[PDB]
Design a protein around this ligand. Structure first.
Ligand SMILES: CCCCCCCCCCCCCCCCC[C@@H](O)O[C@H](CO[C@H](O)CCCCCCCCCCCCCCC)COP(=O)(O)OCC[N+](C)(C)C
Ligand SMILES: CCCCCCCCCCCCCCCCC[C@@H](O)O[C@H](CO[C@H](O)CCCCCCCCCCCCCCC)COP(=O)(O)OCC[N+](C)(C)C
Ligand SMILES: CCCCCCCC/C=C\CCCCCCCC(=O)OC[C@H](COP(=O)(O)OCCN)OC(=O)CCCCCCC/C=C\CCCCCCCC
Ligand SMILES: CCCCCCCC/C=C\CCCCCCCC(=O)OC[C@H](COP(=O)(O)OCCN)OC(=O)CCCCCCC/C=C\CCCCCCCC
Ligand SMILES: CCCCCCCC/C=C\CCCCCCCC(=O)O[C@H](COC(=O)CCCCCCC/C=C/CCCCCCCC)COP(=O)(O)OCCN
Ligand SMILES: CCCCCCCC/C=C\CCCCCCCC(=O)O[C@H](COC(=O)CCCCCCC/C=C/CCCCCCCC)COP(=O)(O)OCCN
Ligand code: SF4
Lengths: 99, 156, 303, 83, 70, 59, 98, 129
C-alpha cells in the first residue's frame, strides 16, 4: 500500500511535469512550419543474457552461507563461478569478444 | 488594471529567463570561429553569462555565423537554421558573414548571410575581437529584454 | 503523513539535481582557469531557474512522423525510475523498509534501459538507432559486473537489507575490507550513467537530463552507503544524515573531477575493458569473498 | 621449472589482470581446505537456534539430558564466547 | 576564487539534508516519539499485532508496563 | 641535429615489470592527472569582469 | 481452485492460441512462447507458496533460467533466418514441405 | 476488501496477454508483454513471494525482454486459502531457495552444464559459414 502509493505519486509527478513541459510552449502561436544488422551487438546481448542467468543462479549466496553443510555449499558456489569463468574463457578464445 | 499588469510581469519573467540562458550553436566556417573560441576562453568566459559552449542544433537558441558562407554551403546552413526550435536568433559575425567582405566579388561566395536567414545582430570586424563578439551577445540580450509578446497578445 | 514524506523525498531531490548543474559548471570552470556562471544570481545561483524556465518555454521539436506514444513514454519511465530508486535508501531510516532493498535497486537499474531503447527507436533515425544500440549494450554489459560486485560485497553483510549496511560498518568502513571491488564498482557506476570517460552518447530533453542527474546522485549515495559506513547513534540521526550527505557530495564532485580530467574511450575499448579486465577479476574476487568468511569463521548473522 | 618460471614472468608483464585473477581464484579454492577455522564456522552455524528446542519426555533413563537450562548437562558455548 | 563554488554546493547539501531528516522526524511523530518499528521475519509483526491488541487504543506504540499487570 | 621522441626501451627486470603492473592495477598516472587538475582548481582564474573590465589594447 | 488460478491458466491458453495463430513475424512466436513461460512461472510460484512446500521454492528459478536459455537459442535462429531473407517473416520458411 | 485486488491484478494480466497475443507490430507486443510481466510480478509480490517477484522483475524484464527488444530494434475468492501460523525468524522462501547449494547439488550440476552447453551452442550456431 505504501509502496504502491509511492510509485503512483512518482508516476503522477513525472506525467504532470511532462504534460506541462509539452503544453506550455504549445499554447503560444508560432510559425509552426537500415539493413546493416551488425552481428556483434546481437552476440554481446546474448552473452549478457546468459551471464544474467548465471547471476540469477548466484544470487541466493548470502542465505546459502548458513546451512551447516558448509563444505557442500562452498563446493557448489565455487563450481558455479568456475563454470561462469569457463564460459567466459570459451567465448574469449573462440574470438567471441572482438570488434 | 491588473489584467495588463499580470502579462507585463509575465513578459518580464519570460524575457529574463530567455536572455539569461542563451545556448548557441556556432557555424565555425572560417577564421572568425577562432575569435569565438577565444571568447569561450578563460579570459572572457562566455559560460559565466549563461551562454554555454557548443550546444546541439536541436537545443540551441541562437545561431552564430562566423565565417564566409559559400554557395556550396548555403543549403546546409539554411537546413540547420530550419531545424532550430523557436524562439531563434541569428548573429552575423565578421565582414564575410555580414556582406561578403574580402570575397564579396566572388563567384562562389554568398554576399552576406542575410540572403539566406534573417539576422538579429551584426558584429563588424575582420575578425571582431572576442570583446566585440561578447558585446554583440550582450546587445542581443538587451534586444531580447526589450521585446514584448504577452502584451501584444493581450492588446490584440 | 506518508504523502508529506513522499513529497519531502521527491522535491528536494529535484532541487539537488537542479543545482548540481550549477555545481558542475562552476567546478569545471574553476578547474579550467575560469569561472562558471556568476552573472545570473548573486553567485550564479539563479542560473538553474533561468535554465528551467527557458527550457519549458521553448518550442518542442516533435518528429511529426515518429511514434508519439513512445516519445511521451520514455521521459515518464526515466524520471519515474530515477525517483523510485531513492525510496529504499536509509538516511538513516528508509522511507520504505524493504527486506530485499538491494535487489529492488538492481531491478530498477535494469529497467532504466527501456527509456534509452524506446527513445532511440522513436528517434526515427538510423544513426540515432545505432547510437541507442551501442548505449544499451554498454549499459547491460556494465550492470552485469555491477550485480556480481554487489553480491560479492553483500556476502559480508548477511542480507540484502540496506539498513544492515550501517550495522556492518559500525567500526570500520567497507572500503578497507574490499577496495578493489570498490574501484571496479566506481568505474562501473561511471559507465552506468553514461559519464565521462564513458560518455559516448526542450521539455522532454530537460526531463531526460533530470533523470540522468538524479541517477548520478543516487548512484553516488548508494556507493557512500555501501562502502563508506557512517556511524548512526539512534538518539540523533541528524549526525548520520550530515555524514552521508557529505560523502555523497564528495563522490559526485569526484565524478565531475573525473569528467574534467580524462579523454573518453572508444566503444570497443570500453567493451574490452569490461569483458577482459573487470569480469575475470570480478569472478576471482567473488570466489575469494565466498571463501573468506568460511575460512576465517566470520559469517554475518542474519539468515 | 625454467619454462614455468619464464612463462609466469612473461605473463606478469603485458597480462597482469589475468595473473591476479587466476591467483585469487586459486587461493579461494585451495585455502578453505587448509584453514582450521572452517570447522569453527560450521559449529557457529550449528549453535544458532532458529527453532524452539522441543523438550523430551523424561523416563528416568536420560542422565545426559539437562532438566533445566542452568544445569551443567548439555552442550556449552564457552568456546564461542572465547572466540 | 574557488570558494565561490561553495554557495551552490551548500544549497545542494541543504536539499540533500531535507529527505532523510524529514523521514526521521515523521517516524518520531507517527510512532509516539520512538523509531518506527522494523518488522521482518513475521515474528516482529506478531509482536506488533499483539501490542496493538493489548494497547486498548489500537496503536502498537502505546507501551504497557508493569502498571498494567494489576 | 635531430632528436628521438619515442625511442626508449623498457627495462625487463622484475622490479620494473612489477612497477608497470602496479601502475596498471592501481591507476597511478590517472591519479597524477587528477592531482594536476585539482591543483589547477585551487588557483586564480584568468577571467576579467566585462563590461566593467576591458582587455588591454595598444595605440 | 480459486479465480486466480483460473485467470493464470486462461492467460497461458491465450498465449498458446496466439502462438498457434501465426499471423507473421516469428519474433511474435517467440514472444508468445515467453508469455506462456511467464504464466507458467507465475502460477507455479503461487502453488508452491500457497502449500508452503519449502524445498520446491527452487523450482521456479530453475525453470526460468532454462526457459531463458531457450529464448537465446530461438533468438539466434531467428537472426539466422533474417540473414538469409532480410526479414523474419514466417512465410519465408517454405523451402521444406510435406 | 480492496475489491479483490488479486482478482483485479489477474484480470489485468489476462488483458495484457490478450493484447500482446494479437501480435500487432512486435514492438507493441513486447510492450504488452512487459506490462503483463510487471503485473504478474506484482501478483507474486502481493502474494508474499518477495524474492521470486524481484527475480521476475530483474531477470525477466531487465535482461530477457531487453534482449528481445534489442534484437527487434535491430530488424525492420482470494484471501481465504492463506495460512494461519507464522514463519519464525526467517522467510521460508529464502531458506528454500538457499537450500539449492546444500540440498540441490544435482540441480546445480545439471543447470550449470546446460548453461555452458548453451553458450557453446549459441556461438556455434552464430558462427555462420
Ligand atoms: C558414480 C560414477 C560417476 C561416473 C559417471 C559420470 C556421469 C556424469 C558425472 C556427473 C554426476 C555427479 C554425481 C554427484 C551427485 C550429487 C549428490 C552426491 O554427490 O551427494 C552430495 C555431496 O555433494 C558433493 O559435494 C558433490 C560434489 C561434486 C560436484 C563438483 C563437480 C561436479 C562436476 C561434474 C560434471 C559437471 C560438468 C563437467 C565439469 C568437468 C550431497 O551432499 P550432502 O551435503 O552430503 O547431502 C545433502 C542432503 N542433506 C542436506 C540432507 C544433508
Ligand atoms: C513556486 C511555483 C513555481 C511556478 C513557476 C514560477 C517560476 C520560478 C519563480 C522564480 C523567478 C526568479 C526571478 C528572479 C529574476 C531577478 C533577476 C534581476 O537581477 O534582473 C534584473 C531586473 O530586471 C528585470 O526587472 C527582472 C525581471 C524578472 C521578473 C519580474 C517579476 C516576475 C514575477 C512573477 C512570478 C509569478 C509566476 C506566475 C506564473 C508561473 C536585471 O538583471 P539583468 O538585466 O538580467 O542582468 C544585467 C547584468 N549586469 C547587471 C551585470 C550588468
Ligand atoms: C525551479 C522553478 C523553474 C520553473 C519551471 C517552469 C515553470 C513555468 C512557468 C510559466 C511562466 C509563464 C509562461 C508564459 C509564457 C507563454 C509563452 C508566451 O510567450 O505566450 C505568448 C503568446 C503570444 O501569442 P501570439 O502573439 O498570438 O502569436 C502570434 C505569432 N504567431 O501569448 C499566449 O498565447 C499566452 C496565453 C495566455 C497566458 C497568460 C495566462 C497566464 C499563464 C500562466 C502560466 C500557465 C502555465 C503554468
Ligand atoms: C515498479 C516496482 C514494483 C514493485 C516494487 C516493490 C518490490 C518489493 O520488493 O517490495 C514489495 C513490498 C515489500 O516487500 P519486502 O521487502 O519483502 O517486505 C515485506 C515484509 N515486511 O511488499 C509488497 O509486496 C507490496 C507490493 C505488492 C503490490 C504491488 C506490486 C507492484 C505492482 C506493479 C505493477 C506495475 C507494472 C507495470 C509494468 C512495468 C514495466 C516497467
Ligand atoms: C585454476 C583456478 C581456476 C579459478 C580461477 C579463475 C577465475 C577467473 C579467471 C579466468 C577468467 C577467464 C579467463 C579467460 C582466459 C583467456 C586468455 C586469453 O585468451 O588471453 C590471451 C593472452 O593471455 C594469455 O596469454 C593467456 C593467459 C596467461 C596466463 C594468465 C595467468 C595464468 C596463471 C598465473 C598465476 C598462477 C597462480 C599464481 C602463482 C603465484 C602464487 C600465488 C589473448 O589476449 P588478447 O587480448 O585477446 O590478445 C592480445 C592482443 N590484443
Ligand atoms: C593475499 C590475499 C589477497 C586477496 C586478493 C586481493 C588482490 C588485490 C590486488 C589486485 C587487485 C587490483 C584490481 C583493481 C581493479 C583493476 C582493474 C584494472 O586494472 O583495469 C585496468 C584499466 O582500468 C582503467 O583504466 C579504468 C580507468 C577509468 C577512468 C577513470 C579513472 C578512475 C580513477 C579515479 C579514482 C578511482 C576511485 C576508486 C575508488 C572509489 C571508491 C568509492 C587495466 O586495463 P588496461 O590498462 O587498459 O590494460 C588491459 C589490457 N591488457
Ligand atoms: S571575417 Fe575576416 S577574420 Fe573572419 S574569416 Fe573572414 S576574412 Fe578572416
Amino acid at each position: 500500500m505504501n509502496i504502491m502509493l509511492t510509485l503512483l505519486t512518482n508516476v503522477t509527478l513525472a506525467s504532470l511535469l511532462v504534460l506541462i513541459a509539452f503544453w506550455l510552449p504549445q499554447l503560444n502561436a508560432y510559425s509552426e512550419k537500415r539493413l546493416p544488422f551488425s552481428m556483434k551487438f546481437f552476440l554481446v546481448a546474448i552473452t549478457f543474457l546468459l551471464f544474467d542467468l548465471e547471476i540469477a543462479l548466484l544470487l541466493p549466496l548470502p542465505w546459502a552461507s548458513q546451512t551447516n553443510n558448509l563444505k557442500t555449499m562452498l563446493t557448489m558456489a565455487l563450481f558455479l563461478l568456475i563454470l561462469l569463468a569457463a564460459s567466459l574463457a570459451y567465448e574469449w578464445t573462440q574470438k567471441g569478444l572482438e570488434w | 488594471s491588473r489584467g495588463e499588469y499580470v502579462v507585463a510581469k509575465l513578459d518580464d519573467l519570460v524575457n529574463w529567463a530567455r536572455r539569461s540562458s542563451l545556448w548557441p550553436m556556432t557555424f565555425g566556417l572560417a577564421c572568425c570561429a577562432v575569435e569565438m573560441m577565444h571568447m569561450a576562453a578563460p579570459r572572457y568566459d562566455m559560460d559565466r553569462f549563461g551562454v554555454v559552449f557548443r550546444a546541439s542544433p536541436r537545443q540551441s537558441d541562437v545561431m552564430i555565423v562566423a565565417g564566409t558562407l559559400t554557395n556550396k554551403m548555403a543549403p546546409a546552413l539554411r537546413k540547420v537554421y530550419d531545424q532550430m526550435p523557436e524562439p531563434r536568433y541569428v548573429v552575423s559575425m565578421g565582414s564575410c558573414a555580414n556582406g561578403g567582405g574580402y570575397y564579396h566579388y566572388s563567384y562562389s561566395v554568398v554576399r552576406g548571410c542575410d540572403r539566406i536567414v534573417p539576422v538579429d545582430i551584426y558584429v563588424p570586424g575582420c575578425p571582431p575581437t572576442a570583446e566585440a563578439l561578447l558585446y554583440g551577445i550582450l546587445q542581443l540580450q538587451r534586444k531580447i529584454k526589450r521585446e514584448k509578446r504577452l502584451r501584444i497578445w493581450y492588446r490584440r | 503523513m506518508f504523502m508529506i514524506n513522499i513529497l519531502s523525498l521527491i522535491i528536494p531531490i529535484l532541487l539537488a539535481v537542479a543545482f548540481l548543474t550549477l555545481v558542475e559548471r562552476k567546478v569545471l570552470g574553476y578547474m579550467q582557469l575560469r569561472k562558471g556562471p556568476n552573472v545570473v544570481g548573486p553567485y550564479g545561483l539563479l542560473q538553474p531557474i533561468a535554465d528551467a524556465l527557458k527550457l519549458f518555454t521553448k518550442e518542442p521539436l516533435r518528429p511529426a512522423t515518429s511514434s508519439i506514444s513512445m516519445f511521451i513514454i520514455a521521459p515518464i519511465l526515466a524520471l519515474s525510475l530515477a525517483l523510485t530508486m531513492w525510496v529504499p535508501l536509509p538516511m538513516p531510516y528508509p522511507l520504505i523498509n524493504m527486506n530485499l532493498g538491494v535487489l529492488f535497486m538492481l531491478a530498477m537499474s535494469s529497467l532504466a534501459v527501456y527509456s534509452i531503447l524506446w527513445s532511440g527507436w522513436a528517434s526515427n533515425s538510423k544513426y540515432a538507432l545505432i547510437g541507442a544500440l551501442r548505449a544499451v549494450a554498454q549499459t547491460i554489459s556494465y550492470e552485469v559486473t555491477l550485480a556480481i560486485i554487489l553480491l560479492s560485497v553483500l556476502l559480508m553483510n548477511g542480507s540484502y537489507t540496506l539498513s544492515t549496511l550501517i550495522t556492518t560498518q559500525e567500526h570500520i568502513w567497507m572500503i578497507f575490507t574490499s577496495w578493489p571491488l570498490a574501484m571496479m564498482w566506481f568505474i562501473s557506476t561511471l559507465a552506468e550513467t553514461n559519464r565521462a570517460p564513458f560518455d559516448l552518447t526542450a521539455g522532454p530533453f530537460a526531463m531526460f537530463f533530470m533523470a540522468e542527474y538524479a541517477n548520478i546522485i543516487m548512484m553516488n549515495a548508494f556507493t557512500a552507503i555501501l562502502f563508506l559506513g557512517a556511524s548512526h547513534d539512534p538518539h540523533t540521526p541528524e549526525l548520520y544524515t550530515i555524514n552521508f550527505v557529505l560523502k555523497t557530495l564528495a563522490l559526485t564532485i569526484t565524478f565531475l573531477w573525473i569528467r574534467a580530467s580524462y579523454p573518453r574511450f572508444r566503444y570497443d575499448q570500453l567493451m574490452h575493458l569490461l569483458w577482459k579486465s573487470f569480469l575475470p577479476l570480478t569472478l576471482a574476487l567473488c570466489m575469494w569473498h565466498i571463501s573468506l568468511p568460511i575460512m576465517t569463521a566470520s559469517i554475518p548473522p542474519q539468515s | 621449472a625454467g619454462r614455468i618460471a619464464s612463462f609466469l614472468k612473461n605473463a606478469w608483464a603485458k597480462e597482469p589482470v589475468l595473473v591476479a585473477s587466476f591467483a585469487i581464484g586459486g587461493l579461494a579454492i585451495i585455502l578453505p581446505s587448509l584453514s582450521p577455522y572452517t570447522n569453527y564456522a560450521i559449529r557457529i552455524n550449528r549453535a544458532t537456534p532458529y527453532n524452539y528446542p522441543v523438550p523430551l519426555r523424561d523416563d528416568g533413563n536420560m542422565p545426559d539430558v539437562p532438566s533445566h537450562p542452568q544445569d551443567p548437562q548439555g552442550p556449552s558455548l564457552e568456546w564461542l564466547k572465547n572466540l | 576564487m574557488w570558494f565561490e563554488i561553495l554557495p551552490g554546493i551548500a544549497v545542494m547539501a541543504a536539499c540533500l539534508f531535507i529527505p532523510g531528516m524529514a523521514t526521521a522526524h515523521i517516524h518520531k511523530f507517527t510512532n509516539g516519539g520512538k523509531e518506527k518499528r522494523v518488522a521482518h521475519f513475521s515474528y516482529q509483526w506478531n509482536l506488533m499485532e499483539r501490542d496493538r491488541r493489548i494497547s486498548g487504543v489500537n496503536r502498537y506504540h502505546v507501551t504497557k508496563g508493569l502498571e498494567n499487570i494489576d | 641535429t635531430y632528436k628521438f621522441v619515442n625511442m626508449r626501451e623498457p627495462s625487463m627486470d622484475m622490479k620494473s615489470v612489477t612497477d608497470r603492473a602496479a601502475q596498471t592495477l592501481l591507476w597511478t598516472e590517472l591519479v597524477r592527472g587528477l592531482g594536476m587538475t585539482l591543483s589547477y582548481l585551487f588557483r586564480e582564474p584568468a577571467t576579467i569582469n566585462y563590461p566593467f573590465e576591458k582587455g588591454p589594447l595598444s595605440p | 481452485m480459486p479465480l486466480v488460478y483460473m485467470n493464470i491458466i486462461m492467460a497461458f491458453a491465450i498465449a498458446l492460441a496466439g502462438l498457434l495463430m501465426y499471423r507473421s513475424h516469428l519474433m511474435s512466436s517467440l514472444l508468445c512462447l515467453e508469455g506462456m513461460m511467464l504464466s507458467l512461472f507465475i502460477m507455479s510460484t503461487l502453488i508452491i507458496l500457497n502449500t508452503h512446500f519449502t524445498l520446491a521454492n527452487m523450482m521456479p528459478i530453475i525453470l526460468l533460467v532454462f526457459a531463458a536459455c531457450e529464448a537465446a537459442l530461438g533468438l539466434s535462429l531467428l537472426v539466422m533466418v533474417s540473414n538469409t531473407y532480410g526479414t523474419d517473416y514466417v512465410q519465408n520458411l517454405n523451402l521444406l514441405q510435406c | 476488501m480492496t475489491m479483490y485486488i488479486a482478482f483485479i491484478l489477474s484480470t489485468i494480466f489476462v488483458i495484457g496477454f490478450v493484447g500482446f497475443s494479437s501480435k500487432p507490430s512486435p514492438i507493441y507486443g513486447g510492450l504488452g508483454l512487459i506490462v503483463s510481466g510487471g503485473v504478474g510480478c506484482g501478483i507474486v509480490l502481493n502474494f508474499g513471494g518477495s524474492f521470486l517477484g524481484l527475480m521476475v522483475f530483474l531477470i525477466y524484464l531487465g535482461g530477457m525482454l531487453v534482449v528481445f527488444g534489442y534484437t527487434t530494434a535491430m530488424a525492420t475468492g482470494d484471501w481465504v486459502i492463506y495460512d494461519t501460523g507464522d514463519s519464525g525468524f526467517f522467510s521460508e522462501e529464502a531458506m528454500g531457495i538457499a537450500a539449492l547449494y546444500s540440498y540441490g547439488t544435482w540441480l546445480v550440476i545439471v543447470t550449470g552444464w546446460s548453461l555452458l552447453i548453451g553458450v557453446v551452442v549459441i556461438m556455434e550456431i552464430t558462427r555462420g559459414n
